Every structure is written in structure tokens, then in C-alpha cells.
Amino acid sequence: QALQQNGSSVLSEDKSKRLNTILNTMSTIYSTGKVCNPDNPQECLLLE
Amino acid sequence: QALQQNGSSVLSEDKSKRLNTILNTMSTIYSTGKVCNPDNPQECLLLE
């Protein structure tokens, strides 16, 4: 039963690639998001 | 008369400082400003 699980393989190929690109997009948005000042918008800050 | 010109020194000290900081601000805004796509705002392009 530790080797039986199919995981996400039961999904169709199109839906599987859609889920993969959604996960990648969410991770990238979190990793490279920027905010900056209302008065000096030339320099922005990351999160970390 | 090539050495006699008073230049910008006739201005008051506060006004001279104001003009200098205005010029520096304008140059920096031109140099470091950037724009980016409406759909993927994570990466933004400079001018040059």
C-alpha cells in the first residue's frame, strides 16, 4: 500500500499539465513578488 | 567674459539646493524607471 498509490497519475494529461503549471505559477508568484513606496516607486522590496 | 559669468551662484543657498536635488531626482527617475506587462507583472523592463 506504500507503493500502490497512483498519486496524480489518474488525471488526464491536459488536466495534469494544467495543475502542474498552476502550481509552478503560484510558487513563482510567491517567490518573486515586489511592493514599493507610494512616493519613491523606483525601488521596490522583495519578501524575504 | 568667459570667466566673468556668475552661473547659478546668484541663487540663494536653499534655492540652489532645491534645484540640485530636483535635477538629481529627474535624472534618477529617467535612469531607473521601468514598466511591465499587465498579465505577468513579475518581470519589468527598463528603457535602454
Ligand SMILES: *[C@@H]1O[C@H](CO)[C@@H](O[C@@H]2O[C@H](CO)[C@@H](O)[C@H](O)[C@H]2NC(C)=O)[C@H](O)[C@H]1NC(C)=O
Ligand atoms: C491505480 O491505477 C490503476 C491502473 O492505473 C487503476 O486500476 C483500474 O481499476 C479499475 C477498477 O478496478 C479497472 O476497471 C481499470 O481497468 C483499472 N485500470 C485502468 C484502465 O485505469 C486504479 O484506479 C488505481 N488502483 C488502486 C489500488 O488505487
Ligand SMILES: *[C@@H]1O[C@H](CO)[C@@H](O[C@@H]2O[C@H](CO)[C@@H](O)[C@H](O)[C@H]2NC(C)=O)[C@H](O)[C@H]1NC(C)=O
Ligand atoms: C555676481 O557678480 C556680480 C558682478 O559684480 C555681483 O553683483 C553685485 O551686486 C549688484 C548686482 O550686480 C551690483 O550692483 C554690484 O556692483 C555687485 N557687487 C558685488 C560684487 O556684489 C554679485 O555679487 C555676484 N554674485 C554673487 C553670488 O556673489
